[PDB]
Amino acid sequence: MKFVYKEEHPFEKRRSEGEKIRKKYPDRVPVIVEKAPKARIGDLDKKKYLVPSDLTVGQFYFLIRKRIHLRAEDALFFFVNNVIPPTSATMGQLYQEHHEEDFFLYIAYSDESVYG
């Protein structure tokens, strides 16, 4: 899954900025959120988020839904490494399990249940 943020910031700068942002906000995880390419769905103004590490995936669904101006009845799926993460997991658990070597967590969102 291609993230534009990776193409526009080289790995080394990403890594040093992730280190800095984990030090400044130790109880928050930094997350990159991008729309999946083929998804017919609202785009998001910002990509970089600081998220409380005890926030659940469901609560993240709620907040992201608020930001793309979706109704609760409209569909919204998250993907971490092309897999839908469990709704009950915390963002801290997701970070520990799936953070990349630049200290960032990468999440894609779509209106479809399969990434593409």
Partner: peptide, 8 residues
Amino acid sequence: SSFEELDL
């Protein structure tokens, strides 16, 4: 460029 904090 910056990070947007998200809370409930």
